[PDB]
């Protein structure tokens, strides 16, 4: 349904940064800098530019003060300056609204193209960026919970197959998905950089941003984030986890920022860079697909997500999913999940796992 342009797709390297609108810059600074330990590349009264421990581009996260908390831009770095031209022609062919600024939208980025994409998301494509001191060996700064890289974005959208075809045309390769036996797709993960993903589509009402994810080196670094949150008596801002994912095989944690923006901490997925990387499809009723240990997924994880803005800074209208709901079919009143396919023992009827 989204047509494949004649124009060549831009060569996209990876997810690079997100710009998030926040309502209280000081509260958000405390969360991202004092709790999570992200490093400040630049800040003033209106914005905070933050980067992970191993990054050399200017930033991985921009917090911009504004009236309505929302995603303003999800940015991907492209391989060459000429790929920004290619992006612009590609989205024009798709009949999408675009805006190009030779000196960038945010500090530390040069020539950049922002677009309202066919799923209603604000994508940015850029090459030029101000290099900063790469802190990868600054063990004098290293926190027990250190965030080392930006890993991926996750987007909520009502029609996953529609979105998947579009991202595949753009060069993303699907690595894992969740489907049922009746032709419904609930989620898909897709990559450029050779990890399990750079973005993912989660079926639900949208456009909304589900989360932004950062990596740590080791599993104990994620445990430390939880332990620190207990010590600060903000354990209520731990939403889900820590756990092992089924899809992706990564160790994970979901926490909530002061404006409820969801942040995932993630580590130790696998290499997907080969072009015949085997795709893995999970059944939606498999209770090890999201948490490998079978821990229940809290309904807020399925229902809550962040608003996204269009290029004028207004919130995008939400379009309702009409396909089956992953919440309803697994943990709702008529839901079902299994531990072992075909075994009644360890299955759950009309409720979540573990009691």
Which residue positions form the known binding site for Ca(2+)? 181-182
Q: Cα dist. 242→217, 254, 255, 264, 293 in Å?
A: 15, 8, 10, 10, 11
Interface with its own copies (CB under 8 A), residue from 6, 278, 312, 344? 278
Tell me whether residue 188 is exposed, middle or buried, using C-beta atoms within 10 angstroms of its C-beta: 0 to 12, 13 to 18, 19 or more: buried
Nearest-approach distance from CB 340 to Mn ion, in angstroms: 26
Which is nearest to 41 in space by CA: 17, 63, 59?
A: 59
Is 290 a binding residue for Cl ion by CB under 5 A? The answer is: yes
Identify the CA nearest to 36 among candidates 267, 264, 304.
Answer: 264
Q: How far is the CB of 237 from its own copies (least distance, A)?
A: 8
CA 325 to CA 205: how far, in whole Å? 10
Task: Please say whether the beta carbons of 257 and 309 come within 8 A.
Answer: no
DSSP letter at 218? Answer: S
Distance CA 51, CA 345 (A): 47
Which positions from 37 to 56 touch its own copies by CB under 8 A, shown as an x/- string?
Answer: -----------------x-x
DSSP one-letter string for 214-252: EE-SSHHHHHHHHHHHHHTT-GGGEEEEEEE-STT--EE
Listed ranges 50-58, 289-297, 303-311, 337-345: which one lies at the site for Cl ion (CB under 5 A):
289-297
| 340 near its own copies, rule: CB under 8 A | yes
Query: What's phi and psi for 309, nearest 5 deg?
Result: -100, 155
Near Ca ion in 161-220, by CB under 5 A: 180-182
Binding residues for Mn(2+): 152, 211, 264
Partner in contact with 345, chosen from Cl ion, its own copies, Ca ion, none, beta carbon below 5 to 8 Å by kind: its own copies
Which range, of 59-67, 118-126, 132-140, 173-181, touches its own copies by CB under 8 A? 132-140
Size of the site for Cl ion (CB under 5 A): 1
Nearest approach in angstroms of CB 330 to its own copies is 14
Query: Residues 181 to 240: which contact its own copies by CB under 8 A?
Result: 193-194, 217-220, 223-224, 226-236, 238-240
Reduce the secondary structure of 322-341 to three states and give it as a string.
CCCCHHHHHCCCCCEEECCC
Residues 253-272 that bind its own copies (CB under 8 A): 268, 270-271
The answer to whether residue 327 forms part of the interface with its own copies (CB under 8 A) is: no
Binding-site residue ranges: 152, 181-182, 211, 264
Residue 149 or 164 having the CB closest to its own copies? 149
CB of 285 to Ca ion, least distance (A): 7
Q: How far is the CB of 188 from Ca ion (least distance, A)?
A: 18
174 binds Mn ion (CB under 5 A): no
Q: Please state, in angstroms and rounded to a whole number, the distance separating the CA atoms of residues 39 and 32.
A: 9
Q: Is 26 helix (H, G, I), strand (E, B) or coil?
A: helix
Select from Mn ion, Cl ion, Ca ion, none the partner in contact with residue 290, using the beta carbon and a kind-dependent cut-off of 5 to 8 Å: Cl ion
Residue 31 sits at φ, ψ, to 5 deg, of -65, -55
Among 273, 279, 314, 315, the residue binding its own copies under the rule CB under 8 A is: 273
**Which residue's CB is nearer to Cl ion, number 191 or number 290?**
290
Cβ–Cβ < 8 Å for 222, 143: no
Kindly report the number of other CB atoms within 10 A of residue 329's CB atom.
Answer: 18
Give contact residues for Ca ion (rule: CB under 5 A).
Answer: 180-182
Give contact residues for Cl ion (rule: CB under 5 A).
Answer: 290
């Amino acid at each position: 349904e989204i047509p494949k342009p004649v124009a060549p797709a831009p060569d996209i390297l990876r997810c690079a940064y997100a710009e998030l609108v926040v309502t209280d810059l000081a509260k958000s600074r405390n969360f991202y800098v004092d709790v999570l330990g992200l490093h400040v590349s630049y800040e003033d009264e209106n914005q905070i530019y933050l980067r992970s421990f191993e990054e050399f581009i200017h930033h991985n996260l921009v917090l911009t003060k504004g009236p309505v908390a929302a995603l303003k831009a999800m940015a991907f770095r492209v391989r060459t300056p000429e790929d920004v031209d290619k992006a612009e022609a590609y989205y024009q062919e798709l009949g999408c609204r675009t805006e190009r600024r030779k000196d960038g939208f945010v500090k530390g980025i040069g020539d950049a193209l922002r677009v309202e994409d066919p799923l209603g998301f604000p994508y940015e494509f850029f090459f030029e960026t101000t290099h900063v001191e790469r802190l990868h060996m600054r063990y004098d700064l290293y926190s027990a919970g250190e965030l080392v890289r930006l890993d991926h974005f996750n987007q909520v959208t009502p029609d996953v197959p529609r979105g998947r075809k579009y991202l595949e045309d753009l060069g993303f390769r699907v690595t894992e998905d969740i489907q049922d036996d009746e032709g419904t797709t609930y989620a898909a993960w897709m990559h450029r950089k050779g990890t399990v993903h750079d973005t993912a589509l989660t079926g639900g009402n949208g456009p909304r941003l589900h989360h932004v994810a950062f990596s740590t080196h080791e599993k104990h670094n994620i445990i430390q984030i939880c332990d620190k949150m207990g010590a600060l008596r903000i354990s209520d801002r731990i939403e889900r986890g820590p756990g092992r994912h089924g899809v992706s095989n990564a160790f994970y944690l979901y926490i909530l920022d002061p404006d409820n923006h969801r942040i995932e901490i993630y580590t130790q997925d696998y290499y997907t860079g080969d072009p015949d990387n085997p795709t893995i499809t999970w059944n939606v009723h498999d209770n090890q697909r999201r948490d490998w240990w079978g821990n229940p997924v809290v309904p807020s994880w399925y229902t809550e997500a962040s608003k996204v803005l269009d290029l004028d800074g207004n919130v995008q209208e939400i379009i309702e999913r009409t396909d089956d709901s992953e919440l309803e079919v697994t943990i709702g009143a008529d839901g079902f999940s299994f531990t072992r396919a075909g075994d009644e023992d360890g299955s759950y009827h009309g409720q979540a796992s573990k009691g």
